[PDB]
């Protein structure tokens, strides 16, 4: 088993196209989150909407198309394949910010200004699972429109956006769709570690994942088995070689740490590379780490 | 040890130009042609050259700290997680675009409590001021950005009217003709009747030929050799291009030390006419001579 020879600050995030900057405990080491992209389990296997490359992530591909009010995208995968209403949430690589306004730039697959900015609301007509959104925009989008997500906002002014949560993918979700399950701290002092971007968020700061991006092709590429409980990591200076932390990997696809009280990853330098050590078992004690 | 390329299929991996998916690749219309790319560059052993960073995410990216002139604005420029920029070894900042001779929009936000639009779209001329291997630029906004911008290249138009936007070209990084700008070097079809493999992606270029941007390597491929500093063993890398659900061999490709991959392409096709979803896979070190069976 090994896990990407890379180091943290040329990882990217799985959840917005930015670069981590640094590693976090939450606030509430209690917290479970769902993210649905930037997971995969470590044999390899995609869960939720977690697409291979960092170029596919927090990306929307569809067809304009008319809607009582304007305009709408009909939803197509990002290569521009259809995009059938099943098992996953979404089509691959659709962003996974909840609960706030999200403004898409996107281009026709030119004269001009090639660009429009899709400004995109989660309510009621937000129902990426079955292949529809809806927008307003400045400018005027037709046909195949390919983009990226720039900068999410308050869903209502006085709100705030909160990063940590994801979308409700429609009412045709049901108990087959395959959401990404919750992450689970797993006890025992261990907390998640996340890895957190600079992103532009009105009204708030930074964006958290929990694998890089690159960890997730890793996976996806090597088809490894898995043979122990899980994973333990080095986090180690590349500079002078030394050891500077240790982190256990889960199956299931996160990373864990033991915060020193007050302190955590976070007080950890950026330019670490996690390197394999060993398999442990589910309960392997960790050295605290910050 | 073992030098590899990777396990994904052509359509999962990202352009190393700019930030997109590969789907398709070509051989150039004159074969003869040379290409200078200062993205997407390493060498087998794992050896970044020119601008090229590790992570698609930093592909065509640029960052800097906005100033003013007494005529306009410009960014000095750094790399991209904020620290210095120092002119020393290499074009410009690592992941700055290299889509030469056209205008560029780039969409940067500050990185502030923010309120409001976020987002500037800064437009550069590759003109006199144009010194990114210095540390600077100029732009023009019809937005007002201030302090630590990073943003990405949104796309790319002709520098005048009438021109048009080539995307096979490479920006002059330099001030003056004689500054060093420690460019990544030429690469040359190899002969033997090679041709090199462009990588294409669909990309927003206003007045070019197509609206496409080629690479010579897939960025994942460059990730994959920095990651496994593998030493080379042989003067080429055979590669078969497989189907992954037969597993037949739908091609045979060589991928040279410098990092560039080429075919010998059937005449008036080439792997342009290959399928999509294909793996690349390595088969064994061969002699720089190896005469490949030709493809599409």
């Known amino acids: 088993l090994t896990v990407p020879n890379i180091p943290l600050n040329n990882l990217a995030n799985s959840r917005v196209p930015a670069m981590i900057n640094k590693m976090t405990v939450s606030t ?37 198309f008319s809607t009582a009010s304007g305009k709408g995208l009909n939803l197509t995968e990002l290569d521009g ?23 898409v730039s996107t281009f026709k697959v030119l004269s001009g200004d090639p660009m429009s900015r899709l400004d995109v609301k989660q309510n009621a007509p937000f129902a990426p699972h079955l292949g529809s959104i809806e927008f307003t925009s400045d400018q005027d989008p037709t046909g ?17 956006v909160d990063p940590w949560k994801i979308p409700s993918y429609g009412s045709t979700v049901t ?8 992450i689970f701290p797993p006890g025992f002092g261990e907390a998640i570690v996340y890895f957190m971007s600079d992103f532009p968020i009105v009204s708030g700061a930074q964006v958290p994942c929990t694998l890089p991006q ?65 398999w442990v078992s589910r309960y392997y004690q960790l050295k605290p780490v910050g």
């Open 28 to 64: 509430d080491q209690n917290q479970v989150v769902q993210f649905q992209n930037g997971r995969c389990t470590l044999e390899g296997q995609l869960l939720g909407t977690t697409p291979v490359s960092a170029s596919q992530v927090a990306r929307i591909r569809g067809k304009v």
């Open 81 to 103: 394949t259809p995009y059938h209403a099943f098992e996953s949430p979404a089509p691959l690589g659709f962003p996974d910010i909840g609960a706030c306004d999200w403004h």
């Open 144 to 160: 195949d429109q390919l983009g990226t997500l720039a900068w999410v906002s308050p869903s209502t002014s006085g709100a705030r």
């Open 175 to 182: 108990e087959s769709t395959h959401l990404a399950p919750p």
């Open 214 to 278: 690159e960890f997730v092709s890793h996976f996806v590429e090597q088809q490894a088995p898995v043979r122990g409980e899980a994973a333990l990591l080095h986090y180690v200076d590349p500079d002078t070689h030394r050891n500077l932390g240790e982190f256990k990997l889960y199956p299931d696809g996160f990373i864990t740490c033991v915060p020193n009280t007050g302190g955590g990853p976070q007080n950890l330098p950026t330019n670490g590379v996690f390197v394999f050590s060993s």
